Amino acid sequence: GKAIWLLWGLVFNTTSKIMVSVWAFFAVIFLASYTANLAAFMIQEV
Amino acid sequence: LKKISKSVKFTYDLYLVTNGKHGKKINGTWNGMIGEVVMKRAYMAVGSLTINEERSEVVDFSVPFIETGISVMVSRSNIGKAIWLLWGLVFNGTTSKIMVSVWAFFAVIFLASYTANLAAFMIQEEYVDQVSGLSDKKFQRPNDFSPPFRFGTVPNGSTERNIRNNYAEMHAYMGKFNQRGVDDALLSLKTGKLDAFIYDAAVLNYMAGRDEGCKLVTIGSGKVFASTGYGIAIQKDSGWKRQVDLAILQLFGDGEMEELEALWLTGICH
Amino acid sequence: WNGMMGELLSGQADMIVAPLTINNERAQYIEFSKPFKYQGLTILVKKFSWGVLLNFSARILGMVWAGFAMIIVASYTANLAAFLVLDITGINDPRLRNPSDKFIYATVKQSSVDIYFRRQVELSTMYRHMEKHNYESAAEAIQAVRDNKLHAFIWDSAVLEFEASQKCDLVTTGELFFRSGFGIGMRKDSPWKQNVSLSILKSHENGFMEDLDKTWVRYQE
Amino acid sequence: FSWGVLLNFSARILGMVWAGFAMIIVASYTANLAAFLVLD
Numbered sequence: 112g113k114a115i116w117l118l119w120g121l122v123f124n125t126t127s128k129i130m131v132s133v134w135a136f137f138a139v140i141f142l143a144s145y146t147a148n149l150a151a152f153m154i155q156e157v
Numbered sequence: 158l159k160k161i162s163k164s165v166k167f168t169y170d171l172y173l174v175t176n177g178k179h180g181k182k183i184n185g186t187w188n189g190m191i192g193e194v195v196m197k198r199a200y201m202a203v204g205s206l207t208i209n210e211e212r213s214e215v216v217d218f219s220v221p222f223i224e225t226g227i228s229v230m231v232s233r234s235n236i237g238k239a240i241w242l243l244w245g246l247v248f249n250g251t252t253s254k255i256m257v258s259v260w261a262f263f264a265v266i267f268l269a270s271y272t273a274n275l276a277a278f279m280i281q282e283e284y285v286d287q288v289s290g291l292s293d294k295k296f297q298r299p300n301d302f303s304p305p306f307r308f309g310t311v312p313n314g315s316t317e318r319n320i321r322n323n324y325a326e327m328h329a330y331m332g333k334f335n336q337r338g339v340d341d342a343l344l345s346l347k348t349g350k351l352d353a354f355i356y357d358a359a360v361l362n363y364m365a366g367r368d369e370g371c372k373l374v375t376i377g378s379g380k381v382f383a384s385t386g387y388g389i390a391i392q393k394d395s396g397w398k399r400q401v402d403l404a405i406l407q408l409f410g411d412g413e414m415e416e417l418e419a420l421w422l423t424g425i426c427h
Numbered sequence: 428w429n430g431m432m433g434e435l436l437s438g439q440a441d442m443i444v445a446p447l448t449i450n451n452e453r454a455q456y457i458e459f460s461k462p463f464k465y466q467g468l469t470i471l472v473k474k475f476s477w478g479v480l481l482n483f484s485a486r487i488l489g490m491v492w493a494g495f496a497m498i499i500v501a502s503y504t505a506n507l508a509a510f511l512v513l514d515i516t517g518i519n520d521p522r523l524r525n526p527s528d529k530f531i532y533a534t535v536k537q538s539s540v541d542i543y544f545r546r547q548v549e550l551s552t553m554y555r556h557m558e559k560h561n562y563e564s565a566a567e568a569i570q571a572v573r574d575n576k577l578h579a580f581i582w583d584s585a586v587l588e589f590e591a592s593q594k595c596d597l598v599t600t601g602e603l604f605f606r607s608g609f610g611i612g613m614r615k616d617s618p619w620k621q622n623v624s625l626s627i628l629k630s631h632e633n634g635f636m637e638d639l640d641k642t643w644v645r646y647q648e
Numbered sequence: 649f650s651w652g653v654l655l656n657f658s659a660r661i662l663g664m665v666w667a668g669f670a671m672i673i674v675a676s677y678t679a680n681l682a683a684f685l686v687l688d
């Protein structure tokens with residue numbers, strides 16, 4: 112029951128260790144892709 | 158020429174030279190456009206004629222209308238843990254906690270500014286030329302380095318004459334890299350069979366802005382050696398030379414060359 | 428006439444050697460040789476709560492506020508990046524087409540540039556504006572614009588480039604128009620012409636011009 | 649521990665050196681992906 116709290120917190124910073132590493136790297140490119148959307152929204156301009 | 162005959166009111170007719178290209182004093186005999194004007198079989202020669210001392214003794218050249226020179230084109234290359242704890246914050250008691258938080262605030266400003274400034278760095282990236290100029294070490298010492306270099310030009314031209322009279326060994330080296338046309342040099346350079354091509358400055362500028370892509374460039378931001386001009390060959394001691402050149406000066410003052418050069422000499426690449 | 432042509436035609440001078448602007452009026456009255464300079468015209472211009480806000484029902488609000496803080500700092504990073512990144516051009520400036528008392532562009536009184544601009548009546552308003560602020564010498568205009576009393580200065584390219592090398596605040600514009608040259612003024616048809624032009628050409632052909640540029644033109648300050 | 653560091657007494661010295669290396673590497677990757685996606 113406590114896995115959800117720990118997993119989601121690590122998004123923003125044997126079997127169990129491997130699964131989180133993929134999820135964390137998935138979150139790594141997720142926030143990296145989010146900063147791109149910040150750049151994309153920056154170009155936008157009554 | 159259409160602008161010329163309009164104000165002086167002279168009639169004319171054209172024809173194409175069959176012997177020679179631009180003029181070569183072979184056995185004391187000139188050919189091409191210059192050779193005929195010496196023989197007076199024609200009274201005026203118009204085209205791409207390079208003003209130099211040697212050619213100014215057999216004919217007369219009017220004031221140049223475009224500036225050029227000699228250039229070279231190349232293809233564009235593509236307590237122990239106290240330091241430990243404080244060290245991790247920059248890489249992303251009660252008073253002890255206060256010092257950590259304010260240090261993190263400094264670190265965030267440090268890292269945030271670091272990435273934003275680093276982003277602007279790649280925006281203004283640039284490139285440089287591999288050769289300083291005509292007096293380059295690879296030029297004055299061609300094929301004298303670990304990587305043998307290659308470069309040549311079209312024979313029987315004014316540019317070839319200039320090289321032989323200022324750098325004998327450099328002229329001798331280019332004998333095995335002689336081209337025969339503008340396109341052949343461009344393609345051979347594209348295929349890598351040639352490393353550098355030396356030719357007239359005015360036309361190689363035209364090809365650079367009109368090549369497929371911008372793969373071929375000239376040395377530097379445009380560098381000219383031995384500035385001169387393009388001229389109109391006239392029969393010796395003509396009575397028109399006073400009136401021929403006076404029209405050209407009228408062109409620059411009014412400004413017709415700007416429109417004409419944009420019509421013919423404009424380019425695509427920057 | 429006056430100036431250099433006024434003295435040369437009076438006989439007190441024999442051969443004008445200076446940065447002589449080749450135009451159509453001069454060619455009718457006096458003779459030239461091959462120009463020794465290549466340039467145009469341009470403009471000179473001057474330039475636990477403490478650990479959370481910074482990083483059981485209350486814990487849900489705490490994690491929600493942590494997410495809020497993260498999105499707030501991301502937004503602040505975005506706006507500071509936008510703040511630090513995002514925020515005349517020759518004769519084609521409309522503000523110079525119809526100038527005012529603010530944009531001050533001036534030129535040298537009784538110089539070839541004023542006659543050149545008077546030739547094209549399409550710049551009559553410019554001819555009607557420069558007439559109020561013509562300066563005697565280029566030094567006066569440079570000093571006045573250094574005091575920021577001027578805003579523009581139509582002048583040659585090489586002189587203003589050497590000036591920008593001397594003074595880092597001096598800046599030029601983009602347009603490069605009226606590509607003329609400087610040559611050697613002469614008397615009328617004289618044997619001091621053919622060999623003079625041949626010598627000028629022989630000086631241009633070899634590296635003599637590059638050496639003279641090393642002496643004065645090429646050097647930067 | 650090492651598998652938990654590269655992604656998150658010369659032993660920990662080299663560990664923190666490699667942590668700095670990882671931080672600069674990921675910063676470089678972020679910079680290059682952002683330049684590759686935004687501008688061109």
Ligand SMILES: *[C@@H]1O[C@H](CO)[C@@H](O[C@@H]2O[C@H](CO)[C@@H](O)[C@H](O)[C@H]2NC(C)=O)[C@H](O)[C@H]1NC(C)=O
Pocket residue numbers: 312313335336337
């Ligand atoms: C430069 O001129 C020479 C002489 O005209 C050219 O050499 C001639 O080339 C043609 C075609 O191969 C031969 O038929 C002649 O017999 C050659 N004559 C001599 C004396 O060499 C030479 O080809 C010209 N430059 C070029 C384009 O290479």
